[PDB]
Every structure is written in structure tokens, then in C-alpha cells.
Design a binder for this molecule. Sequence first.
Ligand code: HKX
Ligand code: HKX
Ligand code: HKX
Ligand code: HKX
Ligand code: CL
Ligand code: CL
Ligand code: CL
Ligand code: CL
Lengths: 293, 298, 293, 298
Amino acid sequence: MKRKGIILAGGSGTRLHPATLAISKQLLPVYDKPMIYYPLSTLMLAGIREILIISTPQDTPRFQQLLGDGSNWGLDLQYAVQPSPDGLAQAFLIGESFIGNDLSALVLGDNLYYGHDFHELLGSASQRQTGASVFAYHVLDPERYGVVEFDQGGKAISLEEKPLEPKSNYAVTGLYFYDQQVVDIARDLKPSPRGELEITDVNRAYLERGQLSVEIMGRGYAWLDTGTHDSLLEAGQFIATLENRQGLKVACPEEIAYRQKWIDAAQLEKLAAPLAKNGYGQYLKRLLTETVY
Amino acid sequence: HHHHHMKRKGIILAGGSGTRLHPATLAISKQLLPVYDKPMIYYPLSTLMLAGIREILIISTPQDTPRFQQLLGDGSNWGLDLQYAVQPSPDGLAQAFLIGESFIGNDLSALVLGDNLYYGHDFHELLGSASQRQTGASVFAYHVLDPERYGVVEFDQGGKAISLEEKPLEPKSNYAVTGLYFYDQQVVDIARDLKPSPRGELEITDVNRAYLERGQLSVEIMGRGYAWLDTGTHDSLLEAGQFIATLENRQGLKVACPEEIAYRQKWIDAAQLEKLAAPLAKNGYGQYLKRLLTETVY
Amino acid sequence: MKRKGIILAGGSGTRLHPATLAISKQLLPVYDKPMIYYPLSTLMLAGIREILIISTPQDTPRFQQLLGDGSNWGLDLQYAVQPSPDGLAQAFLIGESFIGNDLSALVLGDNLYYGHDFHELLGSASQRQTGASVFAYHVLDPERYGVVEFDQGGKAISLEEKPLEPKSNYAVTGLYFYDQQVVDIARDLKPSPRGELEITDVNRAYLERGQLSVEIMGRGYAWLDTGTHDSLLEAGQFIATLENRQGLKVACPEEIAYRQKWIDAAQLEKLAAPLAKNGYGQYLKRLLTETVY
Amino acid sequence: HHHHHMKRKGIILAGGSGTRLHPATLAISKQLLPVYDKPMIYYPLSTLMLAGIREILIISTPQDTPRFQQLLGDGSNWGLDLQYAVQPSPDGLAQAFLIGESFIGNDLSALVLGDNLYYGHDFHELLGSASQRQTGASVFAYHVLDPERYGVVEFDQGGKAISLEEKPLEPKSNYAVTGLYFYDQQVVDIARDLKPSPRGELEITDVNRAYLERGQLSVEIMGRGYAWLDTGTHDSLLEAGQFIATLENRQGLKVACPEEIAYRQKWIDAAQLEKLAAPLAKNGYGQYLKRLLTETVY
Ligand SMILES: CN(c1c(N)n(Cc2cccc(Br)c2)c(=O)[nH]c1=O)S(=O)(=O)c1ccccc1
Ligand SMILES: CN(c1c(N)n(Cc2cccc(Br)c2)c(=O)[nH]c1=O)S(=O)(=O)c1ccccc1
Ligand SMILES: CN(c1c(N)n(Cc2cccc(Br)c2)c(=O)[nH]c1=O)S(=O)(=O)c1ccccc1
Ligand SMILES: CN(c1c(N)n(Cc2cccc(Br)c2)c(=O)[nH]c1=O)S(=O)(=O)c1ccccc1
Ligand SMILES: [Cl-]
Ligand SMILES: [Cl-]
Ligand SMILES: [Cl-]
Ligand SMILES: [Cl-]
């Protein structure tokens, strides 16, 4: 079966104002590229080419202007709007017609991942034709997230959204893989006490039926925090340190399309031309003649 | 016949950065990118406010003017009056005086680059000296590692500025001209007579050289105890953010908070500052504005 | 066969003076722990418990004072001196009696690694009873390192030390696994034109006999640069960002010993006592009651 | 009978940090850790040199005194005279005056913490005012986020300092006393009469309060345009390193280069500075010392 992707790049309220007064958090850069390149690249690494970008009404033209229809990168991009930030599970209602009868994956527009064999980690989750897959990651501050509790055998037995007394330090990350049941589960959700349609309620519905795979994303992966001005700075410095050490980019969509064979050398060469005078286009030109393992 | 019985107006040039920082700047102008906790343009705006300037023209691209207007409005909230103009093509810094000719009128002026960040002690007093000069031009020179990127000032043995060179391959000194410029009423006429350089730009260094040739350029040293932060590259932008974060988290005080500067200048009163804090009350920025109302800061 | 480890933590000349005037680079911290904890942890992750620490004559008492005989961490540590910085291959002459008839691994005392399944990456190299194994890593500045050239099939065909015209961007990292032949190869080395016994000559001797395994260390791993004041800062910020995000430490030797079962819960509890009032001892105490996957 | 016909001596307290930063500090004292490109102790040493102080006592643990001596020697290379003393047990900051009693003799003094870093414009002049006071004590107050970690100064409505509290749970202000202290000849006698606090330390705040009670404490504000960098935690040490790196790489000038300060004070001449550059000539620090010989820096 085909798997379609959704990037939810909705409003971060007023929490980062005045920095985000003028423009959505996900159109701002982490080091050298727009924040949205990172979760987009995550979906591309999972082999997903048909992708819905959900943003605020005000910033959808900007996401559209930035990414186009995706055909330059061998993708098929569509756009939709989330009028009010009334919960992550709204993605599946907004995206119901887009998803149709296919499998799906949701990624949050402000989620950054780095590490070895992430392609294989996503490949495994994407291969499951039934059930849902999520990733749990050990964090200092689990109370900010959906929290997973495990029994002594290591089986996931409960999920709580932003608990006052977290049962573990394992947070659910902002990457979710779903089968054909998710739209119908989302359509039956009721708003929580904080007035949102909760993705954790979606995940708990799968858990109750024994159909939730909780994979550990180990400590050798970085799931970088973009929630505060402080953590934003850290993410930028993290990406800068890797890129300047390696001479290789993290989450370059043009590169990922080229390595997936979704575009050819001639198309990559055309994409390198507009930015030929700066580091990004120079990088793209170098991809045409260097073997990188 | 004219009658006498002067005001200084400000201009912020915030016209993006072409393709130099793409793809980071594909969706939005460089000068709306945050430096740590606030939009880049807050920093040079705060610099003009610290110079006592209340009437300011923001020059930006046609595409992003509405975003600057959304952010800053007409300035009345901060005791300012802000006007807006567009720069359809990036034809050089000195074009600010042609675009802003009607805005300037017969007044003195100051131009600041929308990506210039300054920090340090007695900066208010450093600006005061330049602002109080009613004739000629005033610029600031700062020692940098890479003067070849800038307008460079050469000094004689007595410390007098004797030449200015734009991006010399072999700089005569390490003293770069910073992106803050004070001018008298001669500047619009000087700017009108400029020809484009080989790189296709109306050059601010040519304006400054015109004042130098008339013996009316003051070059003040901005000493090494001030920070003039680099926003030219993705690397330097990260450094700028880290620098501001380090200071603010150490001190519990903000750098370039326009609400604060307006309040300290008595351009807005306590009642007004309280109203500005209300929308941001659930975040650290609003809580800071609230703390300002009761705390004495020296 | 048993595999023994060597950490070469010798002099970095005058290149980082005056910062390193008073004390060796490898006794200074990267964020929250002495630099030497990082390569030590790397050897421990490879399952190596018997380890020789080689330092300058002046700083050996300090390494000795810091780490002891290793019995507190379930290790067997020994110490030796490198009087002059006359090449990395001197490790095998200095360490000849220590190595005896066993397999060996050498790590540089200023080499920091991070990433997922690094234990498995080292396990594979450590399992080889014959030949040598090294890791190649794509870098911006290969001219600083031993550089590997590959043919079109991806086979390593040459190695050059600090070439003026590097044949690729793949640098050999500072972790080397050797069979029982390395001492004898090292004993036959002649000094290079720069007056050093070159580890690259050791590696080329294995390459010539078709006995060098060059594994790619992929871009999902971080091999952090400690060669300059600038890169030192970056390494610290990199480790800080991971540790403060996760609430888990990178290269905590006490933790690695505890997870290898080289020390028990009662021994870890004793190790947590001296530093109980600071973050490091608090971390160690938390390890006794938390399951980390 | 004594005869009259004053000199100020300096003390740097560099006695480690107990176990607080272990295991990072197991092998070496905190004050020998680099901040970016130079040992931590260069920063407060440079601060005393900027105050015009040439005769300085370094107090350290018995274990690390040889390392400080290896680094700094007798000071003659930099136009200083350095002496050394040991602090066998960490019994409080004010113990510096008992350990250093013979060193101080009948002179004025200044005490700086070996982990205190300062940066900013006219810092030389800020120190000058304090140094020139021949009687009483002078300290500096700085606005911080976390005054509960420090000696805290309370001010009346006229801006006069009226109380000092060590680590108050409910601070009266956000003004912390920095780790730089200027004293007259009364300090050794004040220090001799101190009793240990509940935490088992001879407290500098008690010394300062004694001067306050005699009406002889000057509290000068170190304004928000100066950086007083935090070295208390692993996090803050990284921030300090990043802050210095950002300034030095922007300016092509160093912060707290003792060779430079000695040269600018005319305590060493060009010939001597050339000799100091020779050992470090293949690295950036030696190349910097060389550049100093030909370049005019304002
Ligand atoms: C660093 N990573 C990475 C690669 N590894 N590869 C190589 C690569 C490997 C496998 C398949 C493809 Br297509 C491409 C790449 O071309 N671009 C990459 O950015 S990643 O898998 O950790 C990742 C990327 C984006 C967002 C989150 C994680
Ligand atoms: C840190 N500085 C500063 C202050 N010093 N004051 C206090 C202050 C002092 C004097 C006059 C006024 Br109004 C307000 C303040 O309210 N806000 C400030 O940000 S500054 O002079 O380095 C500066 C600010 C913006 C851009 C460039 C430099
Ligand atoms: C982050 N890493 C790591 C772990 N992964 N584990 C868990 C762990 C996994 C497998 C075996 C053991 Br023992 C312990 C751990 O206990 N401590 C660790 O630091 S690492 O493998 O990338 C690494 C450590 C030191 C130096 C270089 C790399
Ligand atoms: C950056 N500063 C500085 C200088 N300003 N000068 C120039 C200079 C100016 C005035 C007198 C002398 Br001597 C030397 C210098 O040669 N070295 C300097 O580091 S400082 O005043 O913020 C300072 C230094 C060390 C520790 C704390 C603060
Ligand atoms: Cl892992
Ligand atoms: Cl200065
Ligand atoms: Cl990889
Ligand atoms: Cl100030």
C-alpha cells in the first residue's frame, strides 16, 4: 500500500512572541535552512513523496511560495489550513480527503531528528501495513510531552498527555505512522479538558486494541528541542557543528531526492544554478561529482 | 524667504540580503529573523531610539513591508512615529536618501542598517556626541578581523581620518566603518549626484568620502569594549544569538527592548507600558515588561 | 582471544598554548567530564577492560591520580610514558610488553565519538581475530588526516598521511583495531620525513597484504573535532545539548561499567557517594532505580 | 616613630572549587581551565593589571601551586612581580587577608576571585576611580538574574547602599557584589576579627559590612553594558568561552591578553614583547603578539 505524509506546521500561539510575531516558527531557519526542511526530509527519508503541508491561514502562501508543488524535488506537495490550533489530531480531519484509503504518516513541522540508520528506523515503521507506530525518547522533562509507561518486560502499557507526575522519562516523539484506521479514530475524538483533539488519544485508541508499536529511539539519536528560544539556539549550533565538521548537510531535500533517484543529475544541476554563488548551491553542485557513502 | 526660529530623523534600511542567505531567507527577510528572542530589526530600531530619534522610516522590499508593519505598526505604542517605504530593487545603501527624500525634508538624519547589532557601556553617550553635531557627518570606526569586507578608514600618525576605501583588497587599517551614519542637510544632494559603482550600487562610502573631502566627516572610534555583532553569515547569526542569550540570561535584563527604551526615555508612561505587557503576559517577554514597572535599574 | 586497549594521550605540542601550558589537553574537560573519559568509554563500549594509558612524563601522575588502577570501575588500568611526541605508532613499541601475544585496539586520547549502535559498530571490528580494522569518516578538511582513496567498487586502495592534494574527503578516525601482527609491523617502521613513526604506515602495511578492513563511519555518527580552541568549544556545546535534552550522559564510565555488569549496584552506590551533592553523583544514584533502554 | 614621605597590591584567590565541578576538576584547578584560548586565571590577572597593579599574590591549593608557577613564573616577563601562597583548606574568601598579611604589609590592596571574568568599555576608568580612593573600601554591584547566589546590595531611594546580605532567600534587589574588592589598610584587622559563619567560612560580605557600618564603603554600579561572566557551572563556563570567542574572532583583538596589557602600560617594551612572541610564533597567540608590535590600536 501507498503511504502519504502530513506535516503539521501550525501556530505556536504567542509563546515565542515577539520573535514569531511576524512569521511562523517553521518558516524560520535552523542554522542554514528553513525549519520545515527538516521534517520534510524526515518524510522523504521514509520514502514518502505525496505530502500535505498544513499551516495557519496567514502563512500557507509562504509555505506554497517556498516549496511549490514539489515537482522540482520529485515530490507531489499539497496544502491545507488549520484555522485554529485546536490539537494535533485535527491533521487527520483536515487531511481526510488527502489520505483517502491509504496509509499515513504525520510529522510535526518543528521536529528535528539526527542519527545513524534513521532511514532503516523509519523503513521498519513504514513497512507495517496494519497498526500504528510511534517512537519513545528519553528526555529530561517528560511532563511537556505524551509520556509512555512500560511494564517490567518492556511493553508499553499506558500513555498520558503532559502528566503532572510522569510515570517515566520516555516521551513520544513528533513522528507517527498510521494504518487505514486513523481517520475514523480521529473523527470519533472528543476535545480534552484543555479544548484540543489529542494525538495521544489517537495513540491510546491503538494501544487499547494492542495495535500500537512503541519503538525506542535510542540515546544515540538526537531529537532536538525547538520549543524555546534557548533550545532553538542549541539546535542551530548542533546542526552547524555537524555540517562544518563533515562538509555534508543534514536534511538537504534536494540531496535526499537525488539519492532516492526521484530526480536525476540533470535536474539537480538545474537546482544548483539559482544558488551557485553561495554555499548551498556549491554544495548541490559538489553532489554531482562526489561519491558519499 | 525662509524663517528659522534641529530635529534628527532616522532611516532603517531593511531590504533583505538578495540570495546570499538562501534558502534560510527564501520565506522571509533577514531583518525579521530572530536574534535570540526578538526580531533582528528591534536591535537597530533600539539604536535609533537610544540616539533620541522618534521619527523613523523603515525601508523594505515590497513583499515584506506588510510583515514589518504587522510587527511595528505606526510606532505610537512605543512613543514613535514610523513610516514605510519600499525599495523594489537592491541598488545600494545610499539609495535610502533618494527613497527617503520627502521623509527627511529639511532635517538632519541618521541611517542604520537593519542587520546591525551593537552592545556596550555608555553607548547612549557615544551616540549623543554624534547626534548633537548639527553640521557634517559622523561615522564610527571599529577594529575587525576582516576589514576587506567593509568600508575601511585610514588614519595619519595624529589619529586623523585621511582616506576611506570600500572593500580594499589590501586594507590600510583594521578599522571598518560600522552601519550607523549621522548626516546633516547636505546628504540628499550628495546622494543625488552619486554614480553607480562597478558593482552596480550607490555607495555609502562615496557619500562619506564627499564629507571627508569637505573637511566635515567626524570618525569616532567605537572601542574594543563594545560589541558590533556580525550578521553576514549563518555562522555569525548563530554567534549573535548566543551572545545576546548569554548577556540576558546572566543579567535578567534585555538588550534592545524597544518598550523598555521608550519607557526609560519617558516617551511612554507606566500605564502604557502595563497595556503593552498584557498581550505577552504568559511569556518571558511580557513578564519582563511587567517587572520594569516596579524595579529600579541603574 | 583477549583484546587489550591503549589510549594514547600524549603531548599536543605548543599548538594550543597558553591554554595547554599548565596541563595536558586530555585532562581538560569537554563540558562536564575530563576529555579522557570519552575515549576510555569508547574502549569500554568495545568490551575492553585491560587498558594502557600513555601520556607525557609530566602528566602521568595526574592520569594515575585521576583514574587509579581502574578496579573501582571493573577495569585493569596500567600506565606508560611517551617521552617525546615522535608518532602515534610509538604506542605499539611503548605498549609491546603490555600487549604481549593478544589482540589490541588503540584510541587517541582526544577523540570523541557519538551515535546510535556504536557498540555494534565496535563489536564487529573487535570480533575479527585477524587483520586490522579502521573507520573512515567524511570531513571538510581531509588534508589534516590520514586519507583513504576508494575505487569505483568501494574498495580501499590507498592511504596517504596529510596529503597536499587529498584523493577523497574520507579521513581515518582515531580508533584502530589490530591483530597479533601490529607490534612486529611497528618494530620495522622507519621515521617519516617529518620525523615520526606513522600509524598510517602501520595501516598501509595491512592494506598491502589485503588485511585492512576500512569500515565507513556514516554521517549519522559524530566524530567531534578537538584540534583547535574553536572546535573544542563546539564539542562542549554538542555534549551539553545532548545531555540536557536527554537527561542522560555521553561517555559516563561508571554507567558503562554498570551496564556491562563489570560492577554491581552496591559498587555503583559507593561511587555515587563522593559526588552526591552535585549533578554527576545525582546522575549515578538515579542509574540504580531507573530503567533506560 | 613612623615616617611618611600609596602603592596598591593585588591578591588573586585561585583555590579551586572543592568538589562542585568534579569530575571535570578532578585533575586540575578550575582557575587553570581554559576560557576559550587562555587559562581562566589570565582574566582576573588582566583585571588587576588594568587597575595598574604590578605586585600580586596568587593563592592556590598546595597541589596546584606548581602549575600556577609554571604558567606565570615570577611575573618579570610581563613587568610584574608575582608571589605565591597556599590555602590548605577552603575556609573562605576573607582568609586571603590572613594568608596575605605579610605580603600586604602596610599597603592598600585589591582582591579578585580567580574565576571572575569582566568585559567592557572604559573598564580601565571604572577601576581607576576605585583604585584612586586611598581610604575605605570599594566594590562593584551588577544586576543579575539570580541575586540569591551572591552578596546582595540594598539601596535607598537616593541610590545610597544601605545593607548587604549574603545569599538572601528573598533578595532586596537584583544587585550582586562582583568578585573584585578594593581595600585600605584596615582590612587585615577587620579580617582577623571575623568569626566563621554557619556554613564554616570567613565571609567577604562581613568585611564589606564592617566598612559599610563605618561609612567607608563605596558601591559603584557596574552597568548593564559590561559583561560579568558566570563561571559557576559547566553550562556557564561554556557560555563564557563562546562569549570570548565571538568577540575575539569578530575584532581580531584579544580579551585579557596579559602581554598586551603590559605592553600598553609600558611595563614591557617592544624588544621584550618580541621575545615573548618567539616561543608561540607557530600559533595564533604568538602571531597576535607579533602583530601588536606594528599596529596602532585605539
Ligand atoms: C544525516 N541524515 C542524512 C542522511 N543519512 N543522508 C543519507 C541517506 C541515507 C539513506 C538514505 C538516503 Br535517501 C540518504 C542524507 O542524504 N541526508 C541526511 O540528512 S539523517 O538520515 O540522520 C536525517 C536527514 C534528515 C532528517 C532527519 C535525519
Ligand atoms: C544594553 N543597552 C541598553 C541599555 N543600556 N539600556 C539602559 C539605558 C541607558 C541609557 C539610556 C536609556 Br534610554 C536606556 C536599556 O534600557 N536597554 C539596553 O539595551 S545598550 O546601550 O548597549 C544598547 C541597546 C540597544 C541597542 C544598542 C545598544
Ligand atoms: C551515547 N552512547 C552511550 C550509550 N549508547 N550507552 C548505552 C549503552 C549501549 C550499549 C552498550 C552499553 Br555497555 C551501553 C551508554 O551507556 N553510554 C553512552 O555514552 S555511545 O554508545 O554513542 C558512546 C559512549 C561513549 C563514547 C562513545 C560513544
Ligand atoms: C577588552 N578590554 C581590553 C582593553 N580595553 N585593552 C586596551 C586597553 C585600554 C586601556 C588601558 C589598557 Br592598559 C589597555 C586591552 O589591551 N585588553 C583588553 O582586554 S577590557 O578593558 O574590557 C578588559 C580586559 C581584561 C580584563 C577585563 C576587562
Ligand atoms: Cl542508541
Ligand atoms: Cl573600549
Ligand atoms: Cl549514518
Ligand atoms: Cl552600562
